[PDB]
Design a binder for this molecule. Structure first.
Ligand SMILES: *[C@@H]1O[C@H](CO)[C@@H](O)[C@H](O)[C@H]1NC(C)=O
Ligand SMILES: *[C@@H]1O[C@H](CO)[C@@H](O)[C@H](O)[C@H]1NC(C)=O
Ligand SMILES: [Zn+2]
Ligand SMILES: [Zn+2]
Ligand SMILES: [Zn+2]
Length: 228
């Protein structure tokens, strides 16, 4: 029986911030989810700079003079200036370029730790305040050089684009920090996806490691004769 399957990704307030739908039999469709890291941050931790923005809103910041469709009045030169001094966050096109730089540099990157579906790793991995990653060993994925993995956790997370592919997307003042979230074989075996599972993500930068939490949940609805 085919259903309209929607895979939703939520911010930490458990509100859908991104979704993908497709007509498939239940528990057969496991697409790479590509939410933007900054969408996870919508209405999230203050670091990212999107606290006041709602799910599904637009990237903040002025248009870059280097935008693909041309330069508009009020365009910022800054999308093209050195990223050296900037904080990796989501409030302008250049801060997001900086965020892309951090998520891609071999010495930095980001790592992800499981929420409530974790075992007795509660013991010190912490709550949402530590983005479930209070200590090393808590992370089960991410793009960082020690390549953390797990045989029980439900997802792998990486950057979806390389910086060369992301640079003009950020200069077009579009969301340009996409994650590529793949379902693992253990994840394809759980059926609790309708209640949804949560993770924390943290950048590996400056001895601070700014983070946020996000969720993944399943929704499905009938199609065809079963729709009344
Ligand atoms: C569900 O599937 C139908 C048919 O493919 C599509 O038109 C509709 O927009 C989808 N809605 C949602 C909320 O997924
Ligand atoms: C993710 O990467 C795939 C493969 O390069 C690409 O087709 C897709 O457009 C990308 N999505 C986002 C949101 O970056
Ligand atoms: Zn910060
Ligand atoms: Zn300026
Ligand atoms: Zn400047």
């Amino acid at each position: 029986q085919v259903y309209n399957i929607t895979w939703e990704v939520t911010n930490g307030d458990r509100e859908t911030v991104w979704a993908i739908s497709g007509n498939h039999p239940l528990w057969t469709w496991w697409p790479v989810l590509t939410p933007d890291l900054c969408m996870l941050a919508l209405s999230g931790p203050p670091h990212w700079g999107l606290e006041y923005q709602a799910p599904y809103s637009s990237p903040p910041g002025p248009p870059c003079c280097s935008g693909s469709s041309g330069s508009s009045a009020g365009c910022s030169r800054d999308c093209d200036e050195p990223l050296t001094s900037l904080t990796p966050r989501c409030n302008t096109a250049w801060n997001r370029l900086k965020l892309d730089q951090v998520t891609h540099k071999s010495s930095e990157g980001f790592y992800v730790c499981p929420g409530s579906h974790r075992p007795r790793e509660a013991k010190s991995c912490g709550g949402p305040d530590s983005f479930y990653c209070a200590s090393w060993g808590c992370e089960t994925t991410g793009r960082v050089y020690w390549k953390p993995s797990s045989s029980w956790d439900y997802i792998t997370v990486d950057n979806n684009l390389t910086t060369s592919q992301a640079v003009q997307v950020c200069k077009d003042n579009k969301w340009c920090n996409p994650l590529a979230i793949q379902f693992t074989n253990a994840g394809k075996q759980v059926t609790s996806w309708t209640t949804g599972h949560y993770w924390g993500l943290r950048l590996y930068v400056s001895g601070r490691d700014p983070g946020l939490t996000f969720g993944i949940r399943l929704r499905y609805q009938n199609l065809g004769p079963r729709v009344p």
